[PDB]
Amino acid sequence: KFRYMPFSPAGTPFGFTDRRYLTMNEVGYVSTVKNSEQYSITVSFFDVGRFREYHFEDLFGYDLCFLNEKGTLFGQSKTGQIQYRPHDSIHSNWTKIIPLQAGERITSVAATPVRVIVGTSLGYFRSFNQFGVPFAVEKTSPIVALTAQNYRVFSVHYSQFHGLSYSLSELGTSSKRYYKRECPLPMSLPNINSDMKKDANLDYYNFNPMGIKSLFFSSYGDPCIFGSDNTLLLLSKWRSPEESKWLPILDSNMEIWKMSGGKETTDIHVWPLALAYDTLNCILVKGKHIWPEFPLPLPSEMEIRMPVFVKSKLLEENKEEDKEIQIPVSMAAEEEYLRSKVLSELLTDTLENDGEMYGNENEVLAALNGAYDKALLRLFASACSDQNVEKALSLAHELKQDRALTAAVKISERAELPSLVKKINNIREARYEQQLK
Amino acid sequence: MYYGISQFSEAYNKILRNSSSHSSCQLVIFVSCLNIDALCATKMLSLLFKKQLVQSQIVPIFGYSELRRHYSQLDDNINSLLLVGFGGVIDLEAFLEIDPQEYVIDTDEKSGEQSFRRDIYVLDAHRPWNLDNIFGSQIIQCFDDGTVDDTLGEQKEAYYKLLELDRKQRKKQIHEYEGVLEEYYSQGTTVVNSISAQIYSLLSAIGETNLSNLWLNILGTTSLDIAYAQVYNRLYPLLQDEVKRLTPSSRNSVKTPDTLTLNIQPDYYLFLLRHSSLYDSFYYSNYVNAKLSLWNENGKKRLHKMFARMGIPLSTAQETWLYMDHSIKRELGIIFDKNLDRYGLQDIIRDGFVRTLGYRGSISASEFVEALTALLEVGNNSAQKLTNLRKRWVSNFWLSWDALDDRKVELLNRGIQLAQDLQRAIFNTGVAILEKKLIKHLRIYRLCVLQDGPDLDLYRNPLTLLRLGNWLIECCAESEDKQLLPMVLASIDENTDTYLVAGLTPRYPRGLKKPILNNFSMAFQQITAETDAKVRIDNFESSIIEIRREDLSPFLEKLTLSGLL
Amino acid sequence: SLPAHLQQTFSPEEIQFIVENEPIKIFPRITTRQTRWQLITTDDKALNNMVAMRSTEVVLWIALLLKQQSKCSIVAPQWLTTKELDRKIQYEKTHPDRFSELPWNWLVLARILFNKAKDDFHDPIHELRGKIQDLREIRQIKVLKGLKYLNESHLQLDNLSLLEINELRPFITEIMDKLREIHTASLT
Amino acid sequence: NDTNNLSHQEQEYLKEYCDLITDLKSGDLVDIDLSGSLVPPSDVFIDVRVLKDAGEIQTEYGVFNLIKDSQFFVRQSDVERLIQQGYLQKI
Amino acid sequence: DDDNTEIIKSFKNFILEFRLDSQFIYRDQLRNNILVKNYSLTVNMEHLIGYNEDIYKKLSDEPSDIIPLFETAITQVAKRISILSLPTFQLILNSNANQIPLRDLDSEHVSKIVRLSGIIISTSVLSSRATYLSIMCRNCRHTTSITINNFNVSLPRSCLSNCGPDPYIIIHESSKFIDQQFLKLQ
Numbered sequence A: 001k002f003r004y005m006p007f008s009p010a011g012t013p014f015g016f017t018d019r020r021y022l023t024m025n026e027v028g029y030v031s032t033v034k035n036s037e038q039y040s041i042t043v044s045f046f047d048v049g050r051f052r053e054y055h056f057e058d059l060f061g062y063d064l065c066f067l068n069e070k071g072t073l074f075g076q077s078k079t080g081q082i083q084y085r086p087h088d089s090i091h092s093n094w095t096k097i098i099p100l101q102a103g104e105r106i107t108s109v110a111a112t113p114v115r116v117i118v119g120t121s122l123g124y125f126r127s128f129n130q131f132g133v134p135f136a137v138e139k140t141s142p143i144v145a146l147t148a149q150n151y152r153v154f155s156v157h158y159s160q161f162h163g164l165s166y167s168l169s170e171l172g173t174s175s176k177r178y179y180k181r182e183c184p185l186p187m188s189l190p191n192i193n194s195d196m197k198k199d200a201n202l203d204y205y206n207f208n209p210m211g212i213k214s215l216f217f218s219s220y221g222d223p224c225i226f227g228s229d230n231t232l233l234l235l236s237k238w239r240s241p242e243e244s245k246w247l248p249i250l251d252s253n254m255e256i257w258k259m260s261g262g263k264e265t266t267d268i269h270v271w272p273l274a275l276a277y278d279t280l281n282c283i284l285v286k287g288k289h290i291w292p293e294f295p296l297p298l299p300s301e302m303e304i305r306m307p308v309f310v311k312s313k314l315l316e317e318n319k320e321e322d323k324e325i326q327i328p329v330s331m332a333a334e335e336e337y338l339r340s341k342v343l344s345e346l347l348t349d350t351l352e353n354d355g356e357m358y359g360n361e362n363e364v365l366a367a368l369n370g371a372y373d374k375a376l377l378r379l380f381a382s383a384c385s386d387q388n389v390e391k392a393l394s395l396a397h398e399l400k401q402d403r404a405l406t407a408a409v410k411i412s413e414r415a416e417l418p419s420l421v422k423k424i425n426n427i428r429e430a431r432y433e434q435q436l437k
Numbered sequence B: 001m002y003y004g005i006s007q008f009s010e011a012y013n014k015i016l017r018n019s020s021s022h023s024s025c026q027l028v029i030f031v032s033c034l035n036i037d038a039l040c041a042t043k044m045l046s047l048l049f050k051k052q053l054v055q056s057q058i059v060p061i062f063g064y065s066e067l068r069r070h071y072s073q074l075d076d077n078i079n080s081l082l083l084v085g086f087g088g089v090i091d092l093e094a095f096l097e098i099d100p101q102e103y104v105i106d107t108d109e110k111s112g113e114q115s116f117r118r119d120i121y122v123l124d125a126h127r128p129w130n131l132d133n134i135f136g137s138q139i140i141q142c143f144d145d146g147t148v149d150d151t152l153g154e155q156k157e158a159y160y161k162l163l164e165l166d167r168k169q170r171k172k173q174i175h176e177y178e179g180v181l182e183e184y185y186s187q188g189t190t191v192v193n194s195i196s197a198q199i200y201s202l203l204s205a206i207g208e209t210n211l212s213n214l215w216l217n218i219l220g221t222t223s224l225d226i227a228y229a230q231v232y233n234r235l236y237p238l239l240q241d242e243v244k245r246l247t248p249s250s251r252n253s254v255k256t257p258d259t260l261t262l263n264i265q266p267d268y269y270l271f272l273l274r275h276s277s278l279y280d281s282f283y284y285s286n287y288v289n290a291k292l293s294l295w296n297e298n299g300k301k302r303l304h305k306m307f308a309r310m311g312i313p314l315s316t317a318q319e320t321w322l323y324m325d326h327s328i329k330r331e332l333g334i335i336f337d338k339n340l341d342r343y344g345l346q347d348i349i350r351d352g353f354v355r356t357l358g359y360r361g362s363i364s365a366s367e368f369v370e371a372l373t374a375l376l377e378v379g380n381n382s383a384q385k386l387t388n389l390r391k392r393w394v395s396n397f398w399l400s401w402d403a404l405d406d407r408k409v410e411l412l413n414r415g416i417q418l419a420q421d422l423q424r425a426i427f428n429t430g431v432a433i434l435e436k437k438l439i440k441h442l443r444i445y446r447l448c449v450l451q452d453g454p455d456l457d458l459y460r461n462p463l464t465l466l467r468l469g470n471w472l473i474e475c476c477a478e479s480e481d482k483q484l485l486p487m488v489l490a491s492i493d494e495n496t497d498t499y500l501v502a503g504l505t506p507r508y509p510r511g512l513k514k515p516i517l518n519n520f521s522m523a524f525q526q527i528t529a530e531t532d533a534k535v536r537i538d539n540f541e542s543s544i545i546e547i548r549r550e551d552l553s554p555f556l557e558k559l560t561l562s563g564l565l
Numbered sequence C: 001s002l003p004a005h006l007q008q009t010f011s012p013e014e015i016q017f018i019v020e021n022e023p024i025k026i027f028p029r030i031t032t033r034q035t036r037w038q039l040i041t042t043d044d045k046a047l048n049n050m051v052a053m054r055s056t057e058v059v060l061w062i063a064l065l066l067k068q069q070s071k072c073s074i075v076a077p078q079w080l081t082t083k084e085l086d087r088k089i090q091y092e093k094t095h096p097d098r099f100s101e102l103p104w105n106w107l108v109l110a111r112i113l114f115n116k117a118k119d120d121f122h123d124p125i126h127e128l129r130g131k132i133q134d135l136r137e138i139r140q141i142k143v144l145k146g147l148k149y150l151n152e153s154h155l156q157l158d159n160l161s162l163l164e165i166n167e168l169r170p171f172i173t174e175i176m177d178k179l180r181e182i183h184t185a186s187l188t
Numbered sequence D: 001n002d003t004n005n006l007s008h009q010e011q012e013y014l015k016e017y018c019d020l021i022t023d024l025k026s027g028d029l030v031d032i033d034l035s036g037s038l039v040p041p042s043d044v045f046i047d048v049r050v051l052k053d054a055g056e057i058q059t060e061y062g063v064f065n066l067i068k069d070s071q072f073f074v075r076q077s078d079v080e081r082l083i084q085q086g087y088l089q090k091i
Numbered sequence E: 001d002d003d004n005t006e007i008i009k010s011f012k013n014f015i016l017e018f019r020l021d022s023q024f025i026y027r028d029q030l031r032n033n034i035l036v037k038n039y040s041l042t043v044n045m046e047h048l049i050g051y052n053e054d055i056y057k058k059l060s061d062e063p064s065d066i067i068p069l070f071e072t073a074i075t076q077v078a079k080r081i082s083i084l085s086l087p088t089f090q091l092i093l094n095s096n097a098n099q100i101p102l103r104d105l106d107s108e109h110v111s112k113i114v115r116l117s118g119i120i121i122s123t124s125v126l127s128s129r130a131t132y133l134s135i136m137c138r139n140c141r142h143t144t145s146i147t148i149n150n151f152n153v154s155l156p157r158s159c160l161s162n163c164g165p166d167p168y169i170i171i172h173e174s175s176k177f178i179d180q181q182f183l184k185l186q
């Protein structure tokens, strides 16, 4: 049966040892070691130019931790004791102890540049400024996870009596705004496997009874989460509630299956870190325990791809021993067109609302549009070679540039389809009129 | 001027900033040879600066006499200078040929802080601090652990008030502050901290901690245990935390040719246990000689008797410890628990640090420091000969520096081979001193003078002389319960016709509460200031002096007549 | 004028210098993207446009120059892994005359990266050091068989590394030259 | 760019060839030191130890004071000539 | 039966893996010896002890039995590093254990490794010992062979292919031999 527990982004259990990771993100990670009745904590950064790695001793046994590029926040789930540490020396650290009801415990904590947030098993929400001045208290579903990027904050909530849900908000200093409040979440649960399989990974489920492996904002503020099924999900169109939707953008298991030559190397596990545009930052872990250890192994990089393939069909198409399986060009072109379309739309929405950060992202969008038409031309040519004029004509509507339509005319000539040459030229003339208008 | 623990970081920052230019050698390090802690300290610093690409020069120095010489010749563009292991006891602005008006660049109108063209940094564990250096100076910059603000309230007050004061009230106030300062000054000399330890805190601050720096920390620290046990005991727990912190996960995995480990396990106050043999380990131990009186046969038979009762065949106890049988090696840790009590010898058991690298076998820090000191001692008209001797002793600094590198274990083995011979030769002199009863028991202190020997040249180096003194001190500490006394030890040289003299304190047994202080400093200084005698004082350690053959007896006569002992 | 040991051949130092001009993939720990590097024998854009933890490609000598300090990490080449080296040893055993198709700089690059970049591998280094040795030993057997075909006309070699050629150069060329002299003297 | 074993024609020959070398080394192509080192540059910075007491000396990069058995951490491009002359060792 | 294979496997893995810094010193020595047609290996005790003390313990307890196993392990490695025939290789040892004076050797030391020193006073001429040896069976005229090794044997009497009480004779025409020499130490 379910029970409430604390969480922090991508921590590890102690396992057999006296040390563990508390949390990880793109900026860095935090670790701690137990020394009889005391603990030692160490904070690490990947930008070694901008920050200093450092360490200090904890007597109170913190079990909660949250990191950003301004400071680190620490908490104790039973005692209610908390501490915030800026990365500069100038603003000295400060501490507080929060009231708790009998058996109540803190489940998660998070912080913006000016806001501090605490949640509990009994569904109480409390908030303070960067100097601990209390602002407000609210009663909600029990919270299980929290994350933030500048003023944008993303929350997850769960109850036996209300289901699984999420919230999205923006703590603007001009004003605070809610985009979603405890709306239903479609995430894949792990409980059936935990109850039936008896896999001796039970310690991980004790450590993380929700099985939510990690969650973070993209490099452009999109909300993202990695499921217990080892799939990456991203929320699209969040700015428009009648169009907002959840998208499955990468399955790790399918990648390892292809990488192994179509084999079941279950000894390999993927530990996610952060999402950089189109590429996942992750650790590839091997052996008994599905999470990394010390000293930290080097990260890896991996691209997202749409779920379109089938194992049996690809085995049939395929049919040195570990060679990665060969794929039909139709699947590759189809997947590219879908991936190009989704990427372009997300980038377009980002530019439409938040603009360019660097001054060149429009060029990437142009490249995506070129890739999109290129993929469609290959699929179109396949339809023409099959002499399916109806399907080829339907595909021709989706092409953007007249360069591509001209190429489609040449392709139709090679296919010896003058009817399709005619109808494409009708479309080109119609679209030329629309361009003249 | 001085900085504290809360800002050592800032001096390091200032030094980086201050010594920036690549057109010149903008940073210089002066280091005292014949000091292990100083050596490890310096090594740490050089690595630090290496990483930062700071062009610099390292110069080893013997004493005050050479200090002046080296300082004199310095270039004007030398923005930063470091004094490592000396100078905290003396007025440096007085000693050096300094006018501050010759070194001020800029005066900060706001702070009143004077920016000097050359900054002089001091790292020294010795106490008491010279007040002029701390309170007085603007060029001199000392690093202190808190001893200054913990200790020096009355003194700070007195210094400043005495300075500011320049009829009943005036007389009373000046006599008061003269009293304060005179009470502070002319105390005994003492060592209160580890150089390398302080450095390690800075490395901690910055974030430069690793096993290569922690091991140097341990080595530096460990050199204190023989003479300054109290200090060592204060420091020790910190080391355990660090060793437990930096040791990796997945412990007790299978070996590889690349695997390095550092771990806490038993160590024994036995002279170089993992080299030579078990029997030699007991026989030459400095503690065992005081506990069982090995200078005579009624002592040696006790050792034979012990091995017979312990169940170790005496012909195997003399085998080389690497080749000794595996079963005895693993059973030894329990055999000692059953047998050392009957000989009053339980203090042999303790914990220490051991390091191993690949397949080449273990070594403990306690053994390592003996190898390094041996290399310092024996590595390979009157003024010219003294210069040649003091120059030879400086080459051994580099013969020891190059042995701190894992790529050069070949040199470390040579160091160990020399250490064994040094202890052998020391023991063969100690027995002669005791059996001929050359110790003279004067009322105030104990006197001993070596007029001849099998080869008396070995005692011409200060470190060897101190090893012999530390042998005799353990013997005197355990031979009777009564009369903890100062001791004076001297050795003649046939080329100079001068006696090399050292003044040594007593100390309390290992197993037993403020520390005592060495008072020979002020006594030798006062007799030197008074005396007709031809004498020399230029060593960093002021408890060691030199005097001509005919002048030893009048000097010692004036010394014993003095109330300063 | 030029030294006697450099009349006909390259020393191993020059071989290392030649190998150092190749490109390599790195992860930087700092961002340079908005002084500038202004190099004259390479591209300059890559170093001026680095972003932290974004993969990029640079010449090997600059990569080692950065890795001397905290600012960089080096990605190992894909052939330098246990799986690939296993397959190459199996190829070597299977085909008793052909040489396996390892890159021309494999020895030099392995013995550079094991010294300068021991921390950045994924495989345990004490296994790679064994498999590199196995490859070199098998190739030496195959070389010793081949020196029985020195002749008056020519020889063909395939996939033999630069350092391996340079090791053998003064022997092969000298003996071959003397066989040529003996043969042509009988024609004239 | 000592003499007793050379014949006098050889004694003038050597002087003539030295004049030729310095003529090539001067003028155009002066930027590359034709009489310099032929071993490829391995490292920028090195540690060098002081072998002979030549006292204080001048060099194009600056001034050095060669206190016997002191050690420098310095760029190789500077001290290459002093290593060749034999005042220094690389350690 | 299995112990003979585990011990050989252990010494085989010793030669293939002992690095000190970056050179596999025993693989290199074994290869460099074969090129000059020297079939032997000079192992050092301290390296064996450093690698694994248990192997040295086995060697120290029963040297007459274990030295042949290590010698055949050397042969098995020698083939891998040089063939895509060789004799059995000779093992040679170096040690720094305490010297025993020659006058103190006694009944406590029988079948132990001993290190000593002295002056050579006499040398014999060379003589021949057998290693691989071929046999003919007098009655049935069947044939077989035997492999000797020189550690502390006689012709067998289990007749094969009744075949008789003592039917075996030696074919010197198809057998292999080695050199042996005697010395005196004072």
Ligand SMILES: [Zn+2]
Residues within 6 Å of the ligand: E137, E139, E140, E141, E142, E159, E160, E161, E163
């Ligand atoms: Zn028969």
